[model samples]
Structures are given as structure tokens and as C-alpha cells.
Target: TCPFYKKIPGTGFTVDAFQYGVVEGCTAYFLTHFHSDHYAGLSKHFTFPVYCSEITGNLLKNKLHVQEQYIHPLPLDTECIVNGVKVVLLDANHCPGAVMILFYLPNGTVILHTGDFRADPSMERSLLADQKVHMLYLDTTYCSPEYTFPSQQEVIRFAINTAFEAVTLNPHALVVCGTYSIGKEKVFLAIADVLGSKVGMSQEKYKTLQCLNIPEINSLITTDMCSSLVHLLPMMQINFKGLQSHLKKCGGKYNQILAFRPTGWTHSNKFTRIADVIPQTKGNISIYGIPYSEHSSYLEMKRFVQWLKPQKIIPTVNVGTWKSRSTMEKYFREWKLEAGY
Candidate 1:
């Protein structure tokens, strides 16, 4: 299997692979989002032109140092032609710049590549209007029954409410939330709005998100603001090593601290063991794992397949160990997803 890129053979189109970087004489590239796992091996020295959402294009140009001339913005729900293939970018609802790619081949075959999207009713309606899809490339990240979780909005509300409760009890306590470089901006923004405070972001996070022109977030990045009781750190930055001494680094008497990690992995085990909301207290610190995810849940993916009824389904992930064609077939059977609507 390929690392992260897929080629159309004769069409000269490659989707999200920097390892080979425009292989097989490809003329164009389609990037779904700005995530490093998907955009790996890409750099300023990249050769082929890249096409993605407007925010993703901006991130590529400013943060990743890709040339502007090479970055093309694919607007949501709009169609563009590249080498006779009709291409449309659909809102992925994954992150700020994520998108699901639809391609209409000259041969009259419609292919949809769902690039890391959460299930949305509106998105399903839009796709149903396309008549039928020939092939479906799915983001089967959590395509198992045991992986079910609540909606992102609910999780965001829970996180904000929990943080608010913590802050109300102890005004001097710090609310630290963890997230990937891109996703979970909603959790941070909602926390700031409800707490009547601002968020403090590191210089790296500030530079990465400033180009998006989100005033609510960009306006609250001042580290010197004493009123900012919440500090939003990158998910990887707040590890076990940093967890031990992060309070000391603040250099003050903060009676308590609450850390919230919003992710789908909170339900890694069965629902009996791992619940929707989990809170643990250790050494004067409280931590929570909220169920906020960008990928489709098991039920959502099943419903998607049952509705679209694509002739063939291909998983978008390049990993062959965790998933395979047989596993996909098993899911379809479990969901009673057969061909034809």
C-alpha cells in the first residue's frame, strides 16, 4: 500500500502524498487538511502545485512556507476543472481548513474521498444530490461499534461547563486545555467566552492560526494579560513530563488547576470501562477527557455507507495493519450495508 498519496493513473492527479511528491507525471495535488500526518513530506521545496481550502492555502503559504503561486484554494461546494476532471470541495467539518474531495472523471465515474470528516446531516443531503457515487474513499478512523461517542458540540459544552465550574470554585485556578495544532478551536473559544476571560497561546500557536483571521481567537493571545486564567497549550506540549512541573513554571499560588483533554480516544475501551466524561484528581490537579472527535463514529459511518450505497469502498488510511479490505467488508455486513440504494 502507498504511504499517503493515491494516483489516478492516466489522469495525473495525486491526493496528499509528499513522499513521492507528484508521482507518475501528475500535474495537480489535492490536500484535504493541514494536519502533519496527512501533509507529511511537503515543504517549500515541493514541486507540484497544491489545491486545498482557503484557510489551508493560507496555512501552507504562511506557516509551511509554500509558494503562493503553487497553492490553489478550492472553495466549498464549488466546482473546478483540472485536466477534464470536475472537482468539488465539500466542508469536512473536521478542522478549520478540512474538506472532502469529490471528483467526476471524464469517463462518467464519480469518486468521493471523505478526508477526515465528522458526520453531519447537511453534508449527507448535499452528497445525496450528486445522484450516485462510483467509489467511496472513507475516513474509517473509528469504524467500530465500540468507538461510539457524543457529538462535538456536546463535548465542547461539557468541557466549557466543567472548566467554568472549576474556575467558579477557585478563581486563582488555571484552566489548561490540550489540542492538536489545528482542531478543537471551538473548545478554547467557548471556554474564553463563558469564563469572561481570554486565552493565552504560545508564539508558535499564534503564528499558526493568525492567518485564518479569526478575531475571537487572535484577539485573545496576549500572554501578559493577568486576567487570562486559561492557558491553551498544544496537546503534545502538556505531556507527563511537563505535567509534573507546569504549575511551578507559573510561579504563583494557584490553589488548583484543571486540565481538559478532548479527544475520541477516551472511548478506546468498552463503554463500561471508559465513559463519555471521565474526571480524575491527583496531587491537587484535576483532569478530564472529553469526547470531541473529527472522524465519523461507527454508527455514523454505517449510516453514511447505507445511504450513499457506493459500489466499492476504499479506506483513506494508508495503514494496512489496523484496517484492511476484509475489515471494511465486515463493517458493511455488521451495518447491513449492501450495494444499491
Candidate 2:
């Protein structure tokens, strides 16, 4: 179904709007990252002058290279008005291309639309550092107390630990961590840093993101900060279960393998052997399990709303409605902020 347009046939661009929300005549849209849901509309609707973080643009170009002409990239902390809406990009750290966006109206009402954020009290507070946000549109997808994720630092170490295992156990195996090339550069860097190699992103990945920026706004990562052995493999979905078996027959064998999967709670089956899928493909490489999610967990979402201290938190996603309940209410009182359903 086409949501962004009354009819999408006018443009050759295509994407299902049912899964991703429809974009209205919003002259400009500020994005948080390059994920399909957050970004599917770009190619579906022909909107000019899009705004996003430096890495996001890189990701859009990197992941969706053919559609770069419509994009207009911005830097962190850079301020500008796109088709009238005021916007700024913050480092969300949820992913390499991830960001927290702030859109302000001339009427003195400011809204903080986070792409997908974590509860890094130190990192989260940085979004409002030296500034103020009024209405906070948060990522409440996992706003239930039940949903949780590892801390950013812990995740950083997770990759490092996995990388060490890759090298120490099977150094020659191909370690593949799934990511939207730019978004997970830090993951690769975390491992490479430990390996004593600077994060070395392949030219292929680098070129993909480079295509997304407007000439003046293109900013890339510094390899010095990443590990040397780190490589950037484009994110790809495991379509056929047999594909894993295919890896062994011809090209998949050899190499210590570490793969980053692009998935969410729905596809959580891949996280454990309980998913019901048979393990046909085989290798001796160690497969350490770590789910470094990008979205805000239930508590993080509550804290996000709490930290914003909004008079009334208007949660946008389904998670928003659930977290606005009692748990977050308790924190709102503790933090001395007001709230509403």
C-alpha cells in the first residue's frame, strides 16, 4: 500500500507504506538512521531537501546509493531550516548512522524526535546539553519493562570480546557482523581496536555511504579510531535457510566467522537455537551470541520521556502508548515532571 502519496504510480520509486509510516506533505523530513522502516519512504515519495545526520546520509548513500539526489545531509550540532522546519542532528550512538533529531517550530514549541535512543544518562543528557526540548517524540517500541538491551559500553565490549574470540579461535574465518555499513562501524572498530588493527572499512562500504551526501556535508569516520582488521560488509538478510548450507560448498568455508544480523524482536529466532530452524551449515568457528539492539528499551523509553521532562509526552510508536502507563509515571513523579496519556 502507498501511504506517502495519494497514488505512487507517478514516480517509479517503490516501497510498501504499510510497514513503514506514510510521510505527509511534510516539505522536509529529518531522519534518525538508514533502517528500512525509518527510511523506506525516501524512495517511495519524491521529496526534495531531506535532512539527516552525517553518517545517516552516508548510510543512505551507502545502503541505497541510487537514490542520493534527493538527500541533503547535515552535520552533528549543525542547525538549519529545511523547507521551514528547524532541525539539528545529535549522535544517538544507537548505530553508526543513528541520530537523535530535534525539530523546532517558530511558535516556541520544540519537539525532540529521537530516531532510536538508549538510556545513557550521560549520553542521553548530551542531547539537551546547552539546549532545551519541549515535546519529546520517543522510540517506545520496547517501552515495556520486559524489553531490555545491553549498555552502549557493554555492547562496545561485546564486539571486542567477539572479535578476540574470532581471532584467537579461528583467525582465518570471515567475521561478519550485520549493520547498515556506516551505523555499525563502531562495532567493527571495537573489535579491530583490540586486534591492534585500526578499523579498516572496505572501499566498497565506504563508497556506498559516500554517495549519500550533498557535496559540502560529507563527513566520514577516521580509521585511526577503529581497529585495523575490521571490515564493513553490507547488511543482507538471510533469505533462504539453505543459503547457510551454500556457504560451505563453494565460497562460505574458511575464515573465523562473526556475523552481525539486521533484525529486531520479531526475528529474535536467530538469537537462539530455539527458533526451530535446523542447523545444517557447520564450521568450528565460535558463534557468540550478543544482541546489541538500537531501539530504546522499556525503561530507557521511560527515562527518555522522564529526562525530557515534557509537560505531556506524545509517544509516536505503539511502545509509546504502553510506557506512558504507571512505570514511567513513577519516574515522572520522582523526576518531578508532568505527564499525560
Candidate 3:
């Protein structure tokens, strides 16, 4: 049921997770990142080993509890070979240790799998300098034109600055940042550093942060109220029940909480070009959804597609979100874009 690669007739690789009857007898397998959606069906019982970034390999062994024999750590930006295919890795810029893979098959077919990335200009040129891409497995997470979000750098800056400003205005209010399990550590870490306070983090999150080698990330395992006034937790933990539990544990000292979620979906309003600042207050928590995302916006996606000129742009993971091939071709061609054979 998960997304996979099947470019050639009988020999190809699978990414993220394996589908039961969809792909069998693949040449090899690859793991793009540690996102739940990416590794939906993966488990310890998975029989085959997969090539992945060093951090992703660790997640396979530590989180998934996969045996040591099944994890092959591939160096980023280095060329390697598997089953006669030349493979190179690049930073995905979506999450920690996420990568975009370039595959040069034996039959002169070049395929690129952008495993959850916010496309970078340098990375684009490195992947497609004069070579035509036979196929592109895109992360169509924000494929539609309505998903016009800003860059990651700008989003992180805004999130950190806004959180600090909120805390400055309200002394007793707690700043609760919503992020994915493994992604968006930089935003929270920067917040902690700038505020000169140690934020609360779980043992699992601390372990993941260790891989980044950021020497001065101040976080602790024990959750303490009134220490820093800023707490970073999973995005799903922004609901009323979650905040209620926190308040009850803290003996109701902090009555108000500023909660925000950074994602591209916040920009879906047709009339709203600017990001939202004010949040919908839920009980004691003010929840705001910021227009922050790591995926390519429609403009970025179009530019990448135009540069690469791949014969096909197959939407990975979110196949249903994409228009039909004919529809996409007609639309893109209108902008003077043509796919290379």
C-alpha cells in the first residue's frame, strides 16, 4: 500500500516500505527517511536489507529493532554501486538525515527519488547537470498551486521569533512548539538557544538529536514545569486533552499556552497569501498553524520539473493527490516545458 519504485520492466528498487503483492523480486531496496508515512509497513520481520543514510540505518536498528545484518549505511554525496546501478545521495532538506537518491541504471535509464525534500538549487544542478532524467519520483506533498508556502529557513525564523515574542509578552504563558518526531529539530533547538533556556525533550528525541552533532543543544529528559516556559512535542500533541494534562501535572500554574504547527497546509486559503499570526484559541491553548513546510511549493516543483525535463514525474507516496499524466503534461507544456525522451 506504500509508495515504491518500478521504472524498469522486471528489475527495480523499492523505497520506504514494501507492498505485499505490488512489487516482488526487486533488485534491491532503499529507505529514504524515518517518517511514519514513509515506513508505514516496515517492521523487524522485513526479510531484506535496505540501503539508506547513516542516521536512517540507525533508526532501522534502534527504533524498528531491525537486526544488524539488514541495515546498509550509505554515505551522503558519495557514489556507490548496487546491482550494476550507480547510486549517489544528496541532502533532502526535509528532515534530519533525509536524502534524495540518484540512480543511474545499467540500461542508461536515470531515475531520481526525492525522498521527502524541499528542493535546493545546488542539489538540483548536481542531480541534473546535462543528463536527462528518464523518470522522477517526486515528493508531491505540496504539489498543488494552493500550497504556496515560504522557504524552510524563513519559516523556522518566524516560528522561533514568534515564540520568543509570545513568551516576552506573557510571562506566565508556556510556549508549546509542535513538530514531527524526527523532523524540525533545528527550529526548537534554535528557540532554546536564543532564549538561553533548556527545553524539555524525551529520551527518544535526545537520541535523534545526538546524530546531528550540534554541540550546544540544551535539553533534558525530565519534563519540568517553570524551567524554560518552552516545550517542544510532536505535532499531534497540540490538542485540548494534551494541554489539559500538562496543566494538571504542573498544578495549574501556567494557565495559558501558545501552541503552533508549522506546515504548508495553512496556506490553502485562496484569498490569503500571507501566513496566519493569530491562532484559534482552544480552552487555554492558542493553536496557530503556520505556513511552514519542507516540501517544494508549486513554483519550486515547476522549476525543478522544467530543469530536469524528465519523461514522467510520478508522485510518490501521494499518488492520488496528483492529476492524471495527461492532465499534468498538458498543464506543464503550457509553460513551455517539455519532457525529454
Alpha-carbon RMSD to native, per candidate: 2.5, 8.0, 3.1
Cα deviation of 114, candidate 1, in Å: 0.7
- Higher-TM-score candidate of 2 and 3: 3
User: For residues 1-341, could you state the per-residue lDDT of candidate 1 as single tens digits?
Assistant: 34433665347777776666446567888898889977887789886789899999989988889888888887788788876778889888888889988888888888888888886777777854657888887888887677777777667777777888888888888888887668777887788788887787677777777877576655666565355777877787555455557777777857677887876755344553333456677777877777777788788878778877787777765346754657766876655535445
* Stretches > 4 Å off in candidate 3: 1-12, 21-23, 211-215, 218-226, 267-269, 273-276, 282-284, 321-326, 335-341
lDDT of each: 0.75, 0.53, 0.70
Candidate 2 lDDT tens digits, 246-295? 23632433443455443444434324332232221345433333456667
Best by TM-score, which number? Answer: 1
Candidate 1 residue 91 Cα shift, in angstroms, is 0.3
Q: Compose the digit string of candidate 3's lDDT tens values, residues 1-341.
A: 43344343325677765545345566577878888877766678877767889988878777778777877889988889877678888888888779988888777888888889887677665645857778888876666666676666776777778778877877677777777667766666666666666777566766666665445543432255356666777778878788777767666667788876765566354555334456778776787776766678777877777767777667664455335545555555654434432
Separate clash counts for every candidate: 0, 24, 0
lDDT comparison, 1 vs 2, better candidate: 1
Better of 1 and 3 by lDDT: 1
| Candidate 3 structure, TM-score to reference | 0.86
